[PDB]
Symmetry: C2
Subunit: 147 residues, 2 copies
């Protein structure tokens, strides 16, 4: 079962939302519908859940042609377990790094990335955040020795 | 509408099948069922289409515990446009690099990378194969440095 998520980090803070059933904070995201792409689903769901409009940004090799466009690589992909009383799901999670490009905050909270252990968070959050800091740290670094 | 393909390379040869409707050669793959993960889908389709059993492989960080396990990163992800004068689809194609673990070639052709340019391939297949080769090299070294 395909799902997609958005990691938005601005000024040491990550935007998170409460899961309507689990209650723990999660990266805004959700089920990738059939007739849509994971890129469209993450944009659509980030905005309906938070009010913020984002754009997934990742690495692409640069492959271009009239018949196909390359899409950004996710920050990571996890098969996560979710245990409901009626049943257990496995979610194939395409976790994208995202950027804000519009909207207005309506739901969700900016959680300092250092206080992530002071709140109930979906199991992955802390692991994914570390991965995201590293990556941003690297990119910031490499974006250094460009000159 | 997301689909998945596997790229199997052995002895300077990539395994390609003929597109069901386009005829052109493409790597094996197909639509991902609601009921399955892209990883399960690629093994299933490859299975059906070639008879060979394969295992997706790729870059990972190493995340794994009781609550979640990381899956390998595709080789490349192309959002392909497929014009059948009779519809016209858009395919979010998660393309994985895969290795052989069983089964047996029942259908399909081994395409020598040295002849690929004089062969009718589905758009960008040649670009992707090139990526596979370099990518395989990089996973080769990650693997032997890890072996050291």
């Amino acid at each position: 079962m395909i799902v997609t998520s958005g990691v938005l980090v601005e000024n040491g803070k990550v935007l998170l939302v409460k899961h309507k059933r689990l209650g723990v904070y999660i990266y805004p995201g959700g089920h990738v519908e059939h007739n849509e792409t994971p890129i469209e689903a993450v944009k659509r769901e980030f905005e309906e859940e938070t009010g913020i409009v984002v754009e997934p940004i990742g690495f692409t090799y640069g492959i271009i042609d009239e018949n196909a466009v390359e899409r950004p690589m996710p920050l990571v992909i996890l098969e996560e377990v979710v245990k409901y009383p009626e049943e257990t799901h496995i979610h194939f999670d395409l976790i994208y790094l995202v950027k804000r490009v519009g909207g207005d905050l309506k739901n969700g909270e900016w959680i300092d990335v250092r206080e992530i252990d002071r709140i109930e968070t979906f199991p992955n959050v802390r692991k994914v955040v570390s991965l995201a800091l590293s990556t941003l740290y690297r990119l910031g670094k490499i974006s250094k020795l460009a000159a």
